[PDB]
Amino acid sequence: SFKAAGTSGLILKRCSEPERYCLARLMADALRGCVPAFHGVVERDGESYLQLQDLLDGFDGPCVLDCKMGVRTYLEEELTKARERPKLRKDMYKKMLAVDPEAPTEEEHAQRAVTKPRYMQWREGISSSTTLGFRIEGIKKADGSCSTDFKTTRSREQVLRVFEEFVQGDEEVLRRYLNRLQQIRDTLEVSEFFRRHEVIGSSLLFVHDHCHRAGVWLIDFGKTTPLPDGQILDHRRPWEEGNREDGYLLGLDNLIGILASLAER
């Protein structure tokens, strides 16, 4: 979804309505500093783009880790959609045989295809999302090396070992990350945006360099949606269809915990 901007320090992202609505709101919220600066929409190839701060500007050869936050990674309306009018996905099927050949049902196999919520619930359960409320999605590196090979990274200790490898023994980065996550947690807990929105499919982006510069920002507000009038979430309690709960803060709590653990090793 990304394209280079004509201005130093910025990046363009393909405009989507929910995300655009979210960024505008966030620029006036307690979370303003916890997300990339949003500077408006622009037109390029007859196409609209979010004009964003490039979070990597300011770092020297940045290392990047994307952590998808939440116990739930799809909207409830996708559950409704799958029950009234399912669109079978043959792609979402072939991976399941790869990760776990006994995972698809006898019927899914005959279909060679799976619904969206089903595929997503299974991803949640073989990774750490269901149990810890986040998961690692990818790492991008200063050495050029990228990896998304984290589909079965699930246990507390597997997660810890990915971060241990990502920070490469830099106590100052790790310290800075933890200070940033504590301050983000504090912000989320008083944010008016956060208590009025179900935050699904967003990530915390960790960015550090060999100069010990470290930052974290929330990104990807494409599936982040306002709750019905005057309704709010606690972002910790289990999701049950109907309640719209995302377990975002369960995730954050556990992530902080794992980092604090790592720092004491």
Ligand X SMILES: Nc1ncnc2c1ncn2[C@@H]1O[C@H](COP(=O)(O)OP(=O)(O)O)[C@@H](O)[C@H]1O
Ligand Y SMILES: O=P(O)(O)O[C@H]1[C@H](O)[C@@H](OP(=O)(O)O)[C@H](OP(=O)(O)O)[C@@H](OP(=O)(O)O)[C@H]1O
189: helix, strand or coil? helix
**C-to-N gaps above 2.5 Å in the chain, after residues:** none
Q: Which residues are annotated as a binding site for substrate?
A: 68, 89, 116-123, 223
Two structure tokens written together for 81: 């959609």
What is the smallest separation between the CB atom of 222 and Mn ion, expressed in angstroms? 7
Whole-number Å distance between alpha carbons of 90 and 104: 12
Helices (H) and strands (E) in the chain, counts: 10, 11
- Asked whether 54 and 179 are in contact (CB, 8 A), the reply is no
What is the smallest separation between the CB atom of 86 and ligand Y, expressed in angstroms? 13
Whole-number Å distance between alpha carbons of 92 and 199: 23
Q: Which of 12, 22, 23, 55 binds ligand X (CB under 6 A)?
A: 55
What is the smallest separation between the CB atom of 55 and ligand X, expressed in angstroms? 4
Whole-number Å distance between alpha carbons of 106 and 239: 28
Q: Which residues are annotated as a binding site?
A: 1, 13, 53-55, 66, 68, 89, 116-123, 140, 220, 223
According to the binding rule CB under 6 A, does residue 20 interact with ligand Y? no
Nearer to ligand X, 36 or 117 (CB): 36
- Asked whether 80 and 38 are in contact (CB, 8 A), the reply is no
According to the binding rule CB under 6 A, does residue 223 interact with ligand Y? yes
Q: How far is CA 61 from CA 78, 210, 211, in A?
A: 39, 7, 9
What is the smallest separation between the CB atom of 66 and Mn ion, expressed in angstroms? 7
**Contacted by 118, from Mn ion, ligand Y, ligand X, none: CB < 5 to 8 Å by type:** none
What is the smallest separation between the CB atom of 190 and Mn ion, expressed in angstroms? 26
- Stretch binding ligand X (CB under 6 A), from 49-57, 148-156, 224-232, 234-242: 49-57
Residue nearest to Mn ion (CB): 220
Identify which of 79, 76, 121 has the alpha carbon closest to the alpha carbon of residue 233.
76
Q: Which amino acid is at 89?
A: R
Q: Which residues are annotated as a binding site for ATP?
A: 1, 13, 53-55, 66, 140, 220
195: helix, strand or coil? helix
Q: Which of 124, 220, 245, 246 binds Mn ion (CB under 5 A)?
A: 220
Identify which of 72, 85, 19, 119 has the alpha carbon closest to the alpha carbon of residue 243.
72
Q: Which of 20, 123, 140, 197 binds ligand Y (CB under 6 A)?
A: 123
What is the smallest separation between the CB atom of 139 and Mn ion, expressed in angstroms? 14
Binding site for ligand Y (CB under 6 A): 73, 116, 123, 201, 222-223
Site residues (vs ligand X, CB under 6 A): 1, 11, 36, 52-56, 64, 66, 140, 203, 205, 219-220, 222
